[PDB]
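Methods: holo model generation. Sequences were used as deposited, without trimming of termini or removal of tags, and paired with ligand SMILES retrieved from the corresponding compound records. Each pair was processed once, and we did not select among multiple samples. The sequence and manganese (II) ion SMILES for this entry were:
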Amino acid sequence: KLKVVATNSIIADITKNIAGDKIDLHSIVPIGQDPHEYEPLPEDVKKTSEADLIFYNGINLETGGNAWFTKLVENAKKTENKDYFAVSDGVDVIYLEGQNEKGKEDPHAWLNLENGIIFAKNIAKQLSAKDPNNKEFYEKNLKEYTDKLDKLDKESKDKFNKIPAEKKLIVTSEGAFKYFSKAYGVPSAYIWEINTEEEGTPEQIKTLVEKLRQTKVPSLFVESSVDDRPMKTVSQDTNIPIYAQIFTDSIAEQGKEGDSYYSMMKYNLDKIAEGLAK
Ligand SMILES: [Mn+2]
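and the model returned the structure below.
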């Protein structure tokens, strides 16, 4: 069976939904861990060597740890677009605020279901290319999976319409909501823009607090994959309660709510809608 490697639990989850049990999947970044700067383990390095097909997010996700993914994929002598593929190829890339080049991209594409579908299309493409036997299975799973996602996106484009503008702000630690914001029309603020930066300096915190004091935002959120101290601080300083943990860089641990791309997207939608209705 096809030996596949996903860099993180999101891509891995999407992959499972395409490949079912037709492949040997290994997911590098453990659930709940930050996929921006990860130190691949020996099993990770071995599985990547043996892999027929490696999926990563690209658009500047796995290029901290000073390019851990690049170095992973160097050492394993793998070739871009032959052995490994960025599953974000195709997304309308959004860039980080201020800096603006290759390495100014914001990686968080998947917080837009349409992009989640693009990922699935890319994942399915490559699975088929590399394992033509199961081409049909994949495409069938794909069509089903993207329907599931598309429905959900279709249903959610409205969720936020009734939120009073001055409450309508998603606040999370990392600025991982740019795509979400664009897709569902709810602005987002944050303590640090991307996890590769210092995380939760008194300055970032002050900046966010001062922005928040100007709002009537009822709830802050905190992602499942970051230290929550900084946001607790924001919470305390603005007296805005942290309403829910949500999912940016990772799906939930096995069995919890949100433990798949689809249901983490569903969870986020729901919790944020409730959180901001409060
Ligand atoms: Mn992130």
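The pocket of manganese (II) ion is lined by residues 36, 108, 174, 176, 195, 248-249 (CB under 6 Å).
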